[PDB]
């Protein structure tokens, strides 16, 4: 899968790596996919407006080929929002987590 992390706060090596390790856990335990097949991109210091203020805010995009399990999105949103809050200090009600499913996914030159 692919996980895009957009935060308005700055990120460094420690914070990006903590989210990386958590994202590996989320894929292996919740998503049932290998932890190494996770592509994670980070976009920090993103100008973001939400709820009438530019206070710290996050938007995490999750893309997984083949959809998600019946109960998997709720478990991902829980762990991701907990991890973003602990790592970035962003409050829970300012953390969006979006779930998409690509039509196809190419890797190593083949789909």
């Amino acid at each position: 899968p692919v996980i895009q992390t957009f935060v308005s706060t700055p990120l460094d090596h420690e914070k990006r790596n903590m989210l990386t390790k958590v994202y590996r856990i989320v894929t292996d335990t919740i998503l049932g996919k290998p932890a190494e097949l996770v592509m994670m991109t980070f976009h920090d210091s993103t100008p973001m407006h939400f709820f009438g203020s530019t206070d710290p805010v996050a938007c995490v995009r999750v893309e997984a080929l083949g959809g998600y399990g019946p109960s998997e999105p709720e478990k991902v949103t829980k762990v991701v929002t907990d991890a973003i809050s602990y790592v970035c200090g962003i409050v829970a009600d300012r953390i969006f987590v979006l779930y998409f499913s690509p039509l196809h996914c190419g890797w190593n030159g083949t789909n």
């Binding site: 790596n17 903590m18 390790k21 958590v22 590996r24 856990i25 989320v26 292996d28 335990t29 932890a35 762990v79 907990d82 991890a83 809050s85 602990y86 790592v87």
Partner: protein, 156 residues
């Protein structure tokens, strides 16, 4: 930031003020002196234990009901192949049901296997194993801290 002290050539206490952690590094099997690679491996495992905690919950949440995953000791075996044993404590709140206790234990072992990279060589070319000790504590008590020094008596 990180306070490292040698109690002996093979026994090191590591205090991470910013991450709020304490761990005991010991080169158990061989008794060899701990080098910077061993300390780097230890700090890496404490970072992984911090990630496994986030799979269970955000401990900075007010009124956090647990459970807690807390690292205690990293015992490095460097005689033959490079191996490490990570001792951790799982702390569930008092009155936890048998189901809550078993659910917390399995969610912990699953997250710790990924975060600590068990049975596989990690970035430091080390095969990591872990051992989990279950504890129950009144988390709202003023006498509770996830890293009480009594929790470290087995390794000091």
């Amino acid at each position: 930031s990180v306070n490292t002290s040698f109690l002996s050539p093979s026994l090191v206490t590591i205090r991470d003020f910013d991450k709020g952690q304490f761990a005991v590094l010991r080169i158990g099997r061989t008794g060899f002196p701990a080098d910077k690679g061993d300390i780097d491996l230890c700090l890496s495992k404490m970072d992984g234990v911090l990630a496994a905690q986030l799979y269970l919950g955000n401990p900075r949440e007010p009124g956090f009901k647990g459970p807690h995953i807390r690292i205690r000791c990293v015992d490095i075996d460097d005689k033959h192949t490079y191996n490490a044993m990570v001792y951790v404590d799982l702390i569930v709140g008092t009155g936890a049901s048998e189901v809550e206790r078993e659910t917390a234990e399995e969610r912990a072992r699953r997250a710790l296997a990924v975060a600590l990279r068990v049975d596989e060589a990690d970035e430091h070319s080390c095969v990591t194993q872990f051992e989990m000790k279950l504890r129950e504590e009144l988390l709202s008590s003023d006498s509770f801290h996830p890293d009480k020094d009594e929790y470290y008596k087995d390794f000091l």
